[PDB]
């Protein structure tokens, strides 16, 4: 179709704090970690189709600016004495065939899994922090 976005990277909200500072590039990467439906093949020939209970668990990878308040928020979450639960949404406003529309991806029950790999380079600095949160259930709709 004819799809024209606005605000190139989708607006991410967690715990009522919306990320106003994303790195250039792969700012948000919502990878589903497990296959949706696992299937098994029988001797006679039939197949047993069965939804994985892990079917929804996603990892949202976030590239925030090296020290911008978004990095402060995610770093404070990382440094908490007990793991903090994130429950937010990725909302993207776009137009289809000229009609304004919104796509909503709710993220439920996440925590920081893989901590950012902090690098300070001289020849070519990489001023990014990549926090990977693993939400229990992410549902997209539109």
């Amino acid at each position: 179709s004819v799809i024209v976005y606005r605000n190139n990277q989708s607006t991410l909200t967690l715990n009522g704090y919306t990320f106003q500072h994303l790195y250039q590039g792969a700012a948000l990467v919502l990878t589903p970690v497990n296959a949706k439906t696992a299937r098994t093949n029988s001797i006679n020939g039939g197949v047993s189709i069965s939804g994985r209970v892990d079917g929804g668990v996603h990892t949202l990878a976030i590239m925030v600016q090296k020290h911008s308040p978004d990095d402060k928020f995610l770093n404070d979450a990382k440094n908490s004495q007990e793991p903090v639960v994130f429950d937010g949404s990725m909302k993207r406003a776009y137009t289809e065939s000229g009609t304004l529309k919104k796509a909503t991806t709710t993220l439920e029950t996440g925590s920081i899994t893989t901590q950012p790999t902090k690098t300070d380079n001289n020849q070519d600095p990489d001023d990014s922090r990549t926090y990977v949160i693993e939400f229990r259930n992410s549902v997209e709709t539109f």
């Binding site: 007990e82 793991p83 639960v85 029950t109 229990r136």
Partner: protein, 125 residues
């Protein structure tokens, strides 16, 4: 024994929606969950060829549950566990017991208040 008993008392344990856990402690996560139905079938070839059946001795089912418990468990979709009712006085049938005077009644009241303190714990149990 009977083939009819199979379905009859196979359904005799129906899982309520509330999903009791290890006994009501559902606040963990079940990584794996198995049951082991076993049987003792005596080995040697059975004797008659006409009726010498009824030789599959049953066994105590075991149930293995391995899971993990964390400081913060968020349960997805399960109904609250509600306290079961004290349906002890459902048939309680007085009024045939004798007519006895006051402070003969109340002496019984004091005895009842006196050993309820020592029995009601195991009664609740």
């Amino acid at each position: 024994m009977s083939l009819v008993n199979g379905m009859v008392e196979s359904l005799n344990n129906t899982k309520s929606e509330t999903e009791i856990g290890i006994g009501g402690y559902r606040l963990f996560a079940r990584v794996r969950e198995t049951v082991n139905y076993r049987n003792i079938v005596p080995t040697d070839t059975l004797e008659d060829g006409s009726s010498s059946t009824d030789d599959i001795i049953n066994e105590p089912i075991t149930v293995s549950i391995e899971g993990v418990v964390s400081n913060l468990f968020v349960e997805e979709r399960q109904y609250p566990q509600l306290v079961s009712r004290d349906f002890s006085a459902v048939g309680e049938i007085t009024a045939l017991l004798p007519a006895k005077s006051q402070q003969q009644i109340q002496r019984i009241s004091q005895i009842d208040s006196q050993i309820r303190d020592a029995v009601l714990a195991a009664e609740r149990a």
